[PDB]
Amino acid sequence: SMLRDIDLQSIQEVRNYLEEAKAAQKILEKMTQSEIDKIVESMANAAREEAGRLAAMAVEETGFGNVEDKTLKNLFAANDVYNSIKDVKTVGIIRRDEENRVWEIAQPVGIVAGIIPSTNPTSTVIFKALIAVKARNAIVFSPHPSAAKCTAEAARIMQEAAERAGAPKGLISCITQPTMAATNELMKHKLTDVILATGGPGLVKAAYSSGKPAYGVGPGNVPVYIHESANIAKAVQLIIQSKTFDYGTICASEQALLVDESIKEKVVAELKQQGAYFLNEEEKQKVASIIMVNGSLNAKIVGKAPQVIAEMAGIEIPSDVKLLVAEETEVGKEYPFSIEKLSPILAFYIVKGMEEASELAQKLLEVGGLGHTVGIHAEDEKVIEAYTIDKPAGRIVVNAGTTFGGIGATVNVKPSLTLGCGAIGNNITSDNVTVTHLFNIKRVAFGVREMPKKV
Amino acid sequence: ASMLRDIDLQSIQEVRNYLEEAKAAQKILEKMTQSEIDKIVESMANAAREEAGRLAAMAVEETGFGNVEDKTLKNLFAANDVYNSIKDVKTVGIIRRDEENRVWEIAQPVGIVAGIIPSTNPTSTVIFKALIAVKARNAIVFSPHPSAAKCTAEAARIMQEAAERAGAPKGLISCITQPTMAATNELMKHKLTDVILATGGPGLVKAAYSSGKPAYGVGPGNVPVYIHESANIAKAVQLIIQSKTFDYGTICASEQALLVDESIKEKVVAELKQQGAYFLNEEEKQKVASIIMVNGSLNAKIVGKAPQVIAEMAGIEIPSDVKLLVAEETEVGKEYPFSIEKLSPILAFYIVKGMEEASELAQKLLEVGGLGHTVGIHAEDEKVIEAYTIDKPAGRIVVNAGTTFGGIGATVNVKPSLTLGCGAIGNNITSDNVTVTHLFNIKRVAFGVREMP
Amino acid sequence: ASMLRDIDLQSIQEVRNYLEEAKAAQKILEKMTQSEIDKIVESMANAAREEAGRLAAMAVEETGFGNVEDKTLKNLFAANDVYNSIKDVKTVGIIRRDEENRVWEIAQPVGIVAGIIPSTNPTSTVIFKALIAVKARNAIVFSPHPSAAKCTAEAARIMQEAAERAGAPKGLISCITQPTMAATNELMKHKLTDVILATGGPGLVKAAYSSGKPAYGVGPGNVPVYIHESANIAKAVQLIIQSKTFDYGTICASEQALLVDESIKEKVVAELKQQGAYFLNEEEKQKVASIIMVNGSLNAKIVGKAPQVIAEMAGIEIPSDVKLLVAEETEVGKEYPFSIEKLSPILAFYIVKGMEEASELAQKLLEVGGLGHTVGIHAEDEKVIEAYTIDKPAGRIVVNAGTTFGGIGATVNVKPSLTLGCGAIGNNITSDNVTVTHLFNIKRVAFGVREMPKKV
Amino acid sequence: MLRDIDLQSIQEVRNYLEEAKAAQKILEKMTQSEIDKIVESMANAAREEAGRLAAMAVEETGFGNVEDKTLKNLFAANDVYNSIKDVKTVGIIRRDEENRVWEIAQPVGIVAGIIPSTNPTSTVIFKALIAVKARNAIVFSPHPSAAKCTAEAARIMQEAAERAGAPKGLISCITQPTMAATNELMKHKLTDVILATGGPGLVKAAYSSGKPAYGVGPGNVPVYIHESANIAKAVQLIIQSKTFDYGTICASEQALLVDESIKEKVVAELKQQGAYFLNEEEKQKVASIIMVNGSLNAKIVGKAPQVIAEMAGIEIPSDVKLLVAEETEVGKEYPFSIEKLSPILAFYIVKGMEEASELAQKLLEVGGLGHTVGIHAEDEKVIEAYTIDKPAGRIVVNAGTTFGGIGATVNVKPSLTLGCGAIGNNITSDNVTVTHLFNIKRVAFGVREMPKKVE
Ligand SMILES: Nc1ncnc2c1ncn2[C@@H]1O[C@H](COP(=O)(O)OP(=O)(O)OC[C@H]2O[C@@H](O)[C@H](O)[C@@H]2O)[C@@H](O)[C@H]1O
Ligand SMILES: Nc1ncnc2c1ncn2[C@@H]1O[C@H](COP(=O)(O)OP(=O)(O)O)[C@@H](O)[C@H]1O
Ligand SMILES: Nc1ncnc2c1ncn2[C@@H]1O[C@H](COP(=O)(O)OP(=O)(O)O)[C@@H](O)[C@H]1O
Ligand SMILES: Nc1ncnc2c1ncn2[C@@H]1O[C@H](COP(=O)(O)OP(=O)(O)O)[C@@H](O)[C@H]1O
């Protein structure tokens, strides 16, 4: 009669972590800015040394992507995120407004529950560990099952690096054998203060039903408009690099191109030259047959090199092909090329001008991309202003790859791997989530006006 | 063939009718210019201002809470201060450009807002929520507390009518007429509900963060106020009494306990009595205590009641000019009724040796249903203020002001609001005074500025 | 359907109305004499009889299952056999005295009954449940299957109107006109509902026993029939074909697989063919197999359809005088469409070496969605019958009879019923054929006849 | 409270059900004679341990007294055993040759047995006997305040059963009772039937479990003393029943209804046999401790009168056998009109049979519907008239309702699980016994031809 079952063991595990995190966070909350910053620096530096190994671990365990790109993915969290927060004041009085007689104090949310995706398992741990601790919180991680080990390993490195710099034990922890029982327990336990839910909509929904404050994400289905004023060579190059990054595993990555008829041929030609393989009618359907199983995305094509996809669909492509492209006209969840494909596959739509492009992008976003990301390539300022203004996306990327743009690598939004899709994407915010979401502001404010007694 | 009858089913259908009309209304509204929106918002605030007294009378009459003068002032806070704080906010289209970084921001409405309305601030809260929601280009559907169903609906009606006159679409502002759990649940989980603004007790707030929907909740207050020996006592007492006795203590943020430095105790007692306080003796105390808590929870019947009314209920006898009741206290806990949030002109009175002992009791008082809400201190020595305030878990830390008027942003520079988020510690997504910027998302147009290695 | 969106609210409100009306009617009914009750029930059985054909034709027309001749007989079974088995049952006041034990028994109506009706037996099940419920002095509120809403509703009206002509109160018998989960949920959990009679799919029955109310549910059948080498083969095939093809196989207790001794295999095949069975060759079997299941369960579109219609749907070709389809089979499981409950004129045909192998296989077939329901055997060796039947988990173990007519108590002496409890093993509170004695509680008046001791 | 008691207790239930699964399959294979030998050995051990369990039960729960609990245990060991020992439960139990029908006994499988706080050890014995006799396994769940004595009772049963051939795991008991465990037990895949002897909350839960269940209801038994009653004999019978184990059995007298014409004699006779009639001052003090919050006060359950008196702060002679209180009102807020589970008796004056019936009806609606009523009378025509319209499964004539209700002194089946029929949310009004724990399979021969066509 000692606990034997995995659901039950995992609950016990979560409970221990929470007890230890509470005690750890109390200690951490008392430290100075400089004490905190030394801990954060050690972690980022630690992430930097292990970024390649963890990248390789993630590739090995998940079968997604490639080692070089995941290595770069880890460094983004270890470098860019770190740089974006290292100088942020998170301790004590963070703002004084002398003339209005008010000052702001940073206040930790306490204990954070972090849900980690399979696609970005190691990098997402870092990004969250960094911003959480910078704000003086504890954090308990819940991995995607198919990536439990490398995720846990990423967490370990953060804790141990933190500890070397003086952090208490249990500040950073991770469920080692994920279960439904464990995920529910973590989200709802009284000691759990805030949920960062980076996962599919089902899990994000559970988080907004948890009784707890939650920052969730939504899925992407990013349409990109190439206007006839675009630098076509520059645009095709930027897109391919982004689309093929880690073989297209991030959710802000391009899923469909929308192209002005008048430059249609040039863009096609530029694509082919730079490594695109245009599928013919025959090949499309074979590839389409493996894109969706049932009514949802086939997991076996996710983050797979184009040669692997070619073999799987039983077609032959040159070994130097960087991405597959299929010309399409229809949009809907029964047309596999119009959905989010999370792989080096791109749909290709022709448009008459700005209006048909907008109309189509909206159609594409209505398919599970709402509030996430859109892109346009164009040199005409009036067209850019008119196109972007009414698009339902928190990230509207101009003249950049959307993968790198969406996360804040190559455009100036805050570096993040947790992209809020706003209310339209069932989220409390459309922000790239960062350290400022993980502390509350307290306002010390002085009597400055007298309240009237009579009307 | 076609019948209905049970009130719950009718209330559910009503909610469904409102949301549909709200959707259509918001889409038409969303197409309006900043100028057109701002005119609509202006009309609402004007009408609100004029009807403040009438609405105040209905709420006092329907609920039994408070008095018409203070409720009139309360409605005006919403019609004036809240309006003034949002009327110049950019909410249409591009609201910000960052030329050096090559980014610009577009305001995006959340869609349809569900506003839950408490029984204590029923008309003022509708006015406040309607202004910030419509300014952000949303529709809003209200759910009254049952004790205040009629006046709440009337508040909504006045806004819709004021708004529509100024060009707003039909169905933009609506209100459930007979509140039920069924109807509340429908409003919270429905496909058309985009965001919940939940201002109410801990039970409703928990339900809102369990709805599957993005939510801004509140928490309850239990506001402790420290009077330091450096304080201007005569000025502190006056601010305290005006705040505590406002609308007879019905706002979540009213002082509930005074922590007083031993060294000035004598002047404070004398000063309280002179300014209208009645100190209950321990016999009077046990008797008043007997009606504060009822197995279990705060006795609704003393809520927002005049001190003479409360005195009669307890079976004690007090002078007219008496403005509030005070009880001496040493203990803190659910088993000590004078230590809880009382929502009435009743104060606890604790003696402390100094700041360190003051913080300890205050911490203990907050953990009884006040965490993350509001705290107060009266003092003139700036170092004592900083040391005391730095570690208090409250989104509002009010210095040298009444906490009623401070917490809502009337008399201290916090954002005008009647929905006070209590941060993670109060089970809320934010610690801000909720206002117009919380009801639109920002979309970012951002340009390529760097190469990837 | 301008307001069809709120059908959930309408259906709920309607249920509340029906239950309130039911409460008043039953209070009144409970006061009547045995003569009055018995006079009413009789009128209901008589009206059902006259209307048997018209109801039969509505059900066939509305649902597309079955045929008019057989449904007429199904309706008459409820109107005649069920009625006759209950006509003398005492349900008012003191129903039994036991003078030497100094006990007598007083009958107590359960109150208001919630009746769930299947699409396969919509009119006949209304008739059966109405007769036994009212005989026991209860009110009953019906929930139709949505595919069968109109004919079900019509059956209830005929019972109620016929009841009124013989003196019954209004609202005694009612029926939900717009079936919904919301309404079903309301009906099962509502304050005034006392007992649930759930004759429907497994999800609906499980829900009934999750309702907080006492419930009599059913289970599905997957009836295996053993033909032992001692069987009268000519007689058996006749009984089997009649039972299996009745209403085109919609009756759960209908045969689903034959297990045939290897040693007599040649005669059975020949007799089956002569009496109207078509043996599918291996390829015909696959095309028919491919329409048996859609999405991991039975395809509703073949249910209760004529053999020629099934043939057309599968794209195969059979004579017009074929009465049922038969396929040779070796495997058992959900992945073997011929091994599941087919609810249509289709039979599986398994060869077995002897009794012990039949029993192994019989257990396996039941485990695929048939536990506690029905099994059959045809044999003339009493020892073999006894050894085979003894350990089968089925409430009805039918010997030398069609299992359709046997299961329900038409041709064997079990209680006449269209609600077949599958016992604990089938997730039911009883394995009985549900009947009138299940719809009233017994109160016992008992006299002190013994002394409690005072010291140990 | 312990943080992880719930998970280990869930585990224990799971282990028990799985051993019970294996054990029952083995038990089910035995002959009638092997089963009957087992049941007899169980009865003997219950008989031998009656006193030791009684003492444990009194001490752990604070309810009742050791002599009566010992008698209570012996009722289960003897009366129940004797009433079932000759019932056939294996194989063919009946052969109707003219009608051509064989009946075969079929065990329900695994029973979940919920045990009340009032009759912990006696109920275990009772249920273990009828469950095993019908060839089932059973897993018990105690009320937490009686966990140790309940488990001990289960332990003795299994060991008694084992010596005579039973398999291990046949009879088990949750040692750390919890909601989680109870919940796990009622809904578990391996659970076949729930026997729910407990409060109204749990019975509702059992009928909400998705499983077949036999529940009980609460009692609130009114007994009418008609002018035709033998007053001396009636009072003697009533006091014996009412004070048995200090009134802990559910079907215990709670209110007397007395004909005005014999009021005088009855009051004096009650007094003569040890009743103490409370005055207005005493009434109000006692009434104050009968319920706390708006539910029955656990501190008076099964307590001697003197203990109750002291608790209410009144004093009474040490020889007082029961407290009585004259009453006119009926309702949830009149503590003397509700079920008191202790030696307190309401006393109602009535003008005749008709007023008595109305009041009886009102008392039953206060949590006694379907359970038990009593009447003392020698007038045959009144009894018949009084009893016919009472909604109760046990209608006891000229006997104590405690012993009548359980089937000790009137001829209902000896039992400690009393069903309240449909009117009390139960599938039966029977005293539950062994025939409720096996289903009947019917072997039925062809006796008719079906005609294929109608006119
Ligand atoms: N998973 C389930 N959960 C809850 N209830 C269910 C479930 N499955 C069936 N039911 C209950 O039974 C009814 C639906 O049963 P069906 O499975 O649909 O009956 P069936 O005859 O097998 O199929 C016919 C119906 O299904 C459709 O595919 C077909 O077009 C037709 O409407 C409903 O009234 C419902 O209460
Ligand atoms: N260990 C786990 N932790 C969190 N969620 C899980 C876990 N296992 C399963 N899930 C949930 O079940 C589903 C698993 O499917 P997933 O692995 O996301 O497939 P796909 O990648 O094709 O969407 C998701 O909705 C996920 O939230
Ligand atoms: N609008 C509403 N509709 C339905 N129920 C409500 C509503 N507002 C509050 N409630 C319920 O009533 C409670 C309010 O507390 P209550 O005791 O009625 O008044 P108070 O405590 O403010 O004096 C909440 O906890 C909530 O569960
Ligand atoms: N199966 C169970 N296991 C543990 N506790 C239970 C169970 N059923 C009810 N309770 C608890 O028992 C208490 C109610 O006891 P009650 O049923 O009133 O006992 P009594 O019958 O002696 O009056 C509640 O606190 C409830 O949580």
Which 3-state string (H, E, C) describes chain A?
Answer: CCCCCHHHHHHHHHHHHHHHHHHHHHHHHCCCHHHHHHHHHHHHHHHHHHHHHHHHHHHHHHCCCCHHHHHHHHHHHHHHHHHHHCCCCCCCEEEEECCCCEEEEEEECCEEEEEECCCCHHHHHHHHHHHHHHCCCEEEEEECHHHHHHHHHHHHHHHHHHHHCCCCCCCEEECCCCCHHHHHHHHHCCCCCEEEECCCHHHHHHHCCCCCCEEECCCCCEEEEECCCCCHHHHHHHHHHHHCHHHCCCCCCEEEEEEEHHHHHHHHHHHHHCCEEECCHHHHHHHHHHHEECCEECHHHCCCCHHHHHHHHCCCCCCCCCEEEEECCCCCCCCHHHCCCCCCEEEEEEECCHHHHHHHHHHHHCCCCCEEEEEEECCCHHHHHHHHCCCCEEEEEECCCHHHHHHCCCCCCCCCCCECCCHHHCCCCCCECCHHHHEEEEEEEEECCCCCCCC
Q: How far apart are the first and last CA of chain B?
A: 71
Using a CB-CB cut-off of 8 Å, the residues of chain A touching D11 are 1-5, 8
Which residues lie closer than 8 Å to B173 by C-beta, 6 or more apart?
A: B130, B134, B139, B140, B142, B156, B159, B160, B163
Classify B228 as helix, strand or coil: coil
CA A73 to each of CA A52, A80, B223, C119: distance values in angstroms, whole numbers, following the listed order? 10, 10, 47, 58
Q: C123, C73 in Cβ contact below 8 A?
A: no
> C45 and C178, same structural domain?
yes
Q: D24, D137 in Cβ contact below 8 A?
A: yes
Angle between helices C122-135 and C52-63 (to 10 degrees): 130
* Residue in B69, B431, B452 nearest the CB of A440: B431
Given D149, D173, D250, D420, which residue is catalytic? D250
Pick from D60, D115, D140, D179 the residue to mutate for probing ligand 4's pocket: most ligand atoms within 8 Å of its CB: D179
Q: A348, A256 in Cβ contact below 8 A?
A: yes
Six token digits for residue D228: 């035709």
Q: What is the CA radius of gyration of chain C?
A: 23
- Rounded CA gap, A194 and A327, in Å? 44
Q: D442, D102 in Cβ contact below 8 A?
A: yes
Give the DSSP H or E segment for B445. Answer: strand B440-447
Count other C-beta atoms under 10 Å from residue C266's C-beta: 10
Resolution of this entry in Å?
Answer: 4.0
Whole domain around residue B343: which residue ranges? 224-407
Residue type, C63: T
Is the CB of A4 less than 8 angstroms away from the CB of D12?
Answer: no
Is A87 part of a structural domain of the chain? Answer: yes
Measured in whole angstroms, how far is the alpha carbon of residue B262 from the centre of its chain?
A: 33
Q: Which residue of C has its CA nearest to D455?
A: C69
> D281 and D429, same structural domain?
no
Q: Which residue of D has its CA nearest to C113?
A: D422
Q: D249, D119 in Cβ contact below 8 A?
A: yes
Nearest CA to ligand 2 atom 21: A299
Distance B125 CA to ligand 2 centre (A): 42
- Rounded CA gap, B180 and B198, in Å? 16
- Rounded CA gap, D69 and D418, in Å? 18
Which ligand is nearest the CA of D250, by number? 4
Quick one: which of B56, B38, B70, B81 has its CA closest to B433? Answer: B81
Q: Which residues of C339-349 are buried (b: 16+ CB within 10 A; e: fewer)?
A: bbbbbbbbbbb
Which residues lie closer than 8 Å to D190 by C-beta, 6 or more apart?
A: D17, D18, D20, D21, D110
Q: Cis omega (within 30 of 0) on the bond before B93?
A: no
- Rounded CA gap, B61 and B272, in Å? 30
Is B328 part of a structural domain of the chain? Answer: yes
- Rounded CA gap, D140 and A310, in Å? 60
CA B316 to each of CA B269, B278, B283, B434: distance values in angstroms, whole numbers, following the listed order? 21, 12, 10, 41
Select the residue from C2, C5, C13, C186 to test the B interface by mutation, using most B Cβ atoms within 10 A: C13
> B254 and B211, same structural domain?
no
Tell me the backbone φ, ψ of residue B316, rounded to 5 degrees: -120, 170
Is B20 part of a structural domain of the chain? Answer: yes
Using a CB-CB cut-off of 8 Å, the residues of chain A touching D13 are none
Is the CB of D15 less than 8 angstroms away from the CB of A8?
Answer: no
* Residue in A211, A391, A447 nearest the CB of B206: A211
Quick one: which of C282, C299, C364 has its CA closest to C331? Answer: C364
Nearest CA to ligand 4 atom 17: D199
> D130 and D37, same structural domain?
yes
Atom index in ligand 1 nearest the CA of residue C143 equals 34
Which ligand is nearest the CA of D205, by number? 4
- Cβ burial of A53 (10 Å; 0-12, 13-18, 19+) is middle
Distance C346 CA to ligand 1 centre (A): 21
Which ligand is nearest the CA of A113, by number? 2
Quick one: which of C138, C256, C216 has its CA closest to C420? Answer: C216
Q: A47, A172 in Cβ contact below 8 A?
A: no
Q: How many residues does chain D have?
A: 455
- Rounded CA gap, C237 and A3, in Å? 57
Give the DSSP H or E segment for B43. Answer: helix B34-63
> C235 and C214, same structural domain?
no
Give the DSSP H or E segment for B375. Answer: strand B372-378
Nearest CA-CA distance, residue D285 and chain C, Å: 32
- Cβ burial of C89 (10 Å; 0-12, 13-18, 19+) is middle
Using a CB-CB cut-off of 8 Å, the residues of chain C touching B4 are 9-10, 13
Atom index in ligand 4 nearest the CA of residue D301 equals 22
- What are the strands, taking DSSP E only, across D34-136? 92-96, 101-107, 110-115
Quick one: which of C71, C216, C211, C52 has its CA closest to C129? Answer: C216
The 8 Å CB, 24+ separation contacts for D357-362 are: D357/D386, D357/D389, D357/D390, D359/D222, D359/D257, D359/D330, D360/D222, D360/D224, D360/D257, D360/D390, D361/D390, D361/D391, D362/D330
- Rounded CA gap, D195 and D139, in Å? 10
Strand order in the sheet with C324-328: C277-279, C324-328, C346-352, C255-261, C223-227, C372-378, C394-399, D438-445, D101-107, D92-96
Which residues lie closer than 8 Å to B317 by C-beta, 6 or more apart?
A: B311
**B81: which DSSP letter?**
I
Is C113 part of a structural domain of the chain? Answer: yes
- Rounded CA gap, A171 and A169, in Å? 6
Select the residue from C6, C18, C20 to test the B interface by mutation, using most B Cβ atoms within 10 A: C6
Angle at C201 between CA C196 and CA C206, to 5 degrees: 55
- Rounded CA gap, C277 and C287, in Å? 18
* Neighboring chains of D (3 or more beta-carbon pairs < 8 A): A, C
Which residues lie closer than 8 Å to B377 by C-beta, 6 or more apart?
A: B225, B226, B227, B228, B385, B388, B389, B397, B398, B399, B400
> Can you give the CATH number for the domain in which A233 is found?
3.40.309.10
Select the residue from C69, C441, C442, C450 to test the D interface by mutation, using most D Cβ atoms within 10 A: C441
Using a CB-CB cut-off of 8 Å, the residues of chain B touching C16 are 5-6
> C134 and C54, same structural domain?
yes
Angle at B229 between CA B228 and CA B234, to 5 degrees: 90
Six token digits for residue D156: 């003795």
Quick one: which of A202, A170, A172 has its CA closest to A184? Answer: A202
Atom index in ligand 3 nearest the CA of residue B116 equals 1
Q: C167, C198 in Cβ contact below 8 A?
A: no
Residue with tokens 């059913």: C218
Six token digits for residue A238: 């930027």
Is D411 part of a structural domain of the chain? Answer: no
- Cβ burial of D87 (10 Å; 0-12, 13-18, 19+) is middle
In terms of DSSP bridges, do strands A214-216 and A393-398 run parallel, antiparallel, or are they unpaired?
unpaired
Distance A435 CA to ligand 2 centre (A): 27
| B41-B47-B52-B55 Cα dihedral, nearest 10 degrees | -100
Nearest CA-CA distance, residue D351 and chain C, Å: 24
Angle at D220 between CA D219 and CA D224, to 5 degrees: 125
- Rounded CA gap, A105 and A89, in Å? 10
Q: A111, A138 in Cβ contact below 8 A?
A: yes
CA C244 to each of CA A8, B222, C107: distance values in angstroms, whole numbers, following the listed order? 49, 75, 39
Which residues lie closer than 8 Å to C6 by C-beta, 6 or more apart?
A: B13, B16
CB-defined contacts A:B, below 8 A:
213
Quick one: which of B435, B415, B383, B417 has its CA closest to A100? Answer: B415
Quick one: which of C200, C85, C184, C72 has its CA closest to C131? Answer: C85
Nearest CA to ligand 4 atom 25: D144
Tell me the backbone φ, ψ of residue C295, rounded to 5 degrees: 60, 40
Half-sphere exposure of C74 (CA within 13 A, CB side): 28
* Residue in D101, D390, D449 nearest the CB of C411: D449
Q: How many residues does chain A have?
A: 455
- Cβ burial of A352 (10 Å; 0-12, 13-18, 19+) is exposed
- Cβ burial of D50 (10 Å; 0-12, 13-18, 19+) is buried
* Neighboring chains of C (3 or more beta-carbon pairs < 8 A): B, D
- What are the strands, taking DSSP E only, across D39-100? 92-96
> A433 and A288, same structural domain?
no
CA C37 to each of CA C163, D87, D315: distance values in angstroms, whole numbers, following the listed order? 10, 36, 59
Six token digits for residue A114: 């972090």
Six token digits for residue D210: 């998705």
Select the residue from D1, D2, D4, D15 to test the A interface by mutation, using most A Cβ atoms within 10 A: D4
> B144 and B127, same structural domain?
yes
Q: Which residues of C402-438 are buried (b: 16+ CB within 10 A; e: fewer)?
A: bbbbbbbbbbbbbbbbbbbbbbbbbbbbbbbbbbbeb
Distance A294 CA to ligand 2 centre (A): 16
Phi and psi based region of residue C66 (left: phi greater than 0; alpha: psi -120 to 50; beta: remaining) = left
Is the CB of A443 less than 8 angstroms away from the CB of B395?
Answer: yes
Classify B325 as helix, strand or coil: strand
Which ligand is nearest the CA of D199, by number? 4
- Rounded CA gap, A16 and D3, in Å? 10
> A47 and A72, same structural domain?
yes
Give the DSSP H or E segment for D70. Answer: helix D66-74
Using a CB-CB cut-off of 8 Å, the residues of chain C touching B6 are 13, 16
Which ligand is nearest the CA of C250, by number? 1
Six token digits for residue B405: 């008027």
> B25 and B3, same structural domain?
yes
- Rounded CA gap, D405 and B154, in Å? 61
- Cβ burial of B77 (10 Å; 0-12, 13-18, 19+) is buried
Q: Which residues line ligand 3 (CB under 6 A)?
A: B 116, 119, 143-145, 179, 181, 184, 200-201, 203-204, 298, 300, 303
Angle between helices C233-244 and C265-274 (to 10 degrees): 50
Is the CB of C411 less than 8 angstroms away from the CB of D211?
Answer: no
Q: Which residue of C has its CA nearest to D201?
A: C212
Which residues lie closer than 8 Å to B309 by C-beta, 6 or more apart?
A: none
Method by which the model was determined = X-ray
> Can you give the CATH number for the domain in which D93 is found?
3.40.605.10
> C284 and C229, same structural domain?
yes
Give the DSSP H or E segment for D55. Answer: helix D32-61
- Rounded CA gap, D322 and D273, in Å? 9
Q: B224, B376 in Cβ contact below 8 A?
A: yes
Six token digits for residue B112: 């349809």
Is C437 part of a structural domain of the chain? Answer: yes
> B295 and B238, same structural domain?
yes
Give the DSSP H or E segment for B57. Answer: helix B34-63
In terms of DSSP bridges, do strands C372-378 and C223-227 run parallel, antiparallel, or are they unpaired?
parallel
Sign of CA dihedral C417, C418, C422, C428: negative
Is the CB of D4 less than 8 angstroms away from the CB of A3?
Answer: yes
Q: A150, A122 in Cβ contact below 8 A?
A: yes
Nearest CA-CA distance, residue C11 and chain B, Å: 10
Sign of CA dihedral A427, A432, A436, A438: positive
Distance D143 CA to ligand 4 centre (A): 7
In terms of DSSP bridges, do strands C297-298 and B440-447 run parallel, antiparallel, or are they unpaired?
unpaired
Phi and psi based region of residue C376 (left: phi greater than 0; alpha: psi -120 to 50; beta: remaining) = beta
Q: Which residues line ligand 4 (CB under 6 A)?
A: D 117, 141, 144, 177, 182, 198-199, 201-202, 296, 298, 301
C touches A, CB cut-off 8 Å, minimum 3 pairs: no
Six token digits for residue B109: 């409405």
Is the CB of A2 less than 8 angstroms away from the CB of D8?
Answer: yes
Residue A150 a catalytic site member: no
Which residues lie closer than 8 Å to C274 by C-beta, 6 or more apart?
A: none
In chain D, which residues touch A (CB < 8 A)?
Answer: 3-4, 7-8, 10-12, 14-15
Which residues lie closer than 8 Å to B77 by C-beta, 6 or more apart?
A: B124, B408, B410, B416
Is C414 part of a structural domain of the chain? Answer: no
Q: How many residues does chain C have?
A: 456
Is the CB of A446 less than 8 angstroms away from the CB of B412?
Answer: yes
- Rounded CA gap, A324 and A332, in Å? 20
- Rounded CA gap, D111 and A167, in Å? 54
Q: Which residues of B359-397 are buried (b: 16+ CB within 10 A; e: fewer)?
A: bebbbebbebbbbbbbbbbbbeeeebbeebbeebbbbbb
CA B29 to each of CA B38, B86, C410: distance values in angstroms, whole numbers, following the listed order? 12, 18, 70
Q: What is the CA radius of gyration of chain B?
A: 23
- Rounded CA gap, C194 and C212, in Å? 10
Give the DSSP H or E segment for D269. Answer: helix D263-272
Residue type, C304: G
Is C412 part of a structural domain of the chain? Answer: no
Count of the separate structural domains present in chain C = 2
